[PDB]
Amino acid sequence: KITVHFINRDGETLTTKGKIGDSLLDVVVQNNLDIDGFGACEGTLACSTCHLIFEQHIFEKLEAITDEENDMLDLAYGLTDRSRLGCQICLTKAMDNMTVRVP
Amino acid sequence: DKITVHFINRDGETLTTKGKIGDSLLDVVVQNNLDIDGFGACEGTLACSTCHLIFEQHIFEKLEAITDEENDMLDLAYGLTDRSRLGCQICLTKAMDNMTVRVP
Ligand code: FES
Numbered sequence: 568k569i570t571v572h573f574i575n576r577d578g579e580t581l582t583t584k585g586k587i588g589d590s591l592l593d594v595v596v597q598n599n600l601d602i603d604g605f606g607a608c609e610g611t612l613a614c615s616t617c618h619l620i621f622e623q624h625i626f627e628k629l630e631a632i633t634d635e636e637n638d639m640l641d642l643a644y645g646l647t648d649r650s651r652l653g654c655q656i657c658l659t660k661a662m663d664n665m666t667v668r669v670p
Numbered sequence: 671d672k673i674t675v676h677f678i679n680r681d682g683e684t685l686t687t688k689g690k691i692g693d694s695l696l697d698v699v700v701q702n703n704l705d706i707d708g709f710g711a712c713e714g715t716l717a718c719s720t721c722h723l724i725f726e727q728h729i730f731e732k733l734e735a736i737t738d739e740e741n742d743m744l745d746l747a748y749g750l751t752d753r754s755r756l757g758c759q760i761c762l763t764k765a766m767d768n769m770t771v772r773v774p
């Protein structure tokens with residue numbers, strides 16, 4: 568299991584654990600993280616609520632983005648150069664102790 | 671609450687409740703605890719399509735003009751029709767009394 572920190576929109580840092588292979592939405596849902604609206608479509612690429620902003624060194628080694636994710640991601644609020652839809656990103660060793668930001 | 675709205679749920683059952691002019695249809699659903707699975711998940715912030723509703727033609731054609739934002743998100747909705755709108759963007763007016771909207 569690995570530690571993941573979430574900077575929520577209110578500014579509070581949510582520290583929690585997930586298992587390698589778990590999506591970031593899985594992490595939010597299982598641990599009942601208090602992130603308003605997160606995971607609206609329950610990970611079917613029909614919403615932008617699971618948008619997360621990653622550290623650059625983490626972002627650059629994420630799995631190649633699919634066109635389906637990109638179309639949904641295009642509509643997210645507060646898009647950055649390090650943005651992905653969290654329901655598509657699964658935990659890896661390199662993410663231990665990483666921080667993600669909820670825009 | 672002064673006007674009646676009939677919601678045809680995904681199971682084909684009709685849920686009837688009331689709201690006041692000025693409320694969104696999302697408000698009407700969530701404030702009355704209607705049993706519509708996952709409806710309103712992004713909380714009216716135009717970031718999902720879980721509040722998708724299908725309107726009868728005579729009501730649909732009287733609705734407020736759809737924004738590009740709403741249209742862009744509605745495009746990717748399940749069961750999108752010509753008479754579809756995002757419910758959280760639709761404010762109740764007096765004309766909507768006894769209208770029927772359907773959840774795909
Ligand atoms: S939960 Fe909707 S696209 Fe990620």
Ligand code: FES
Binds near residue numbers: 721
């Ligand atoms: S509740 Fe998400 S867009 Fe209407």
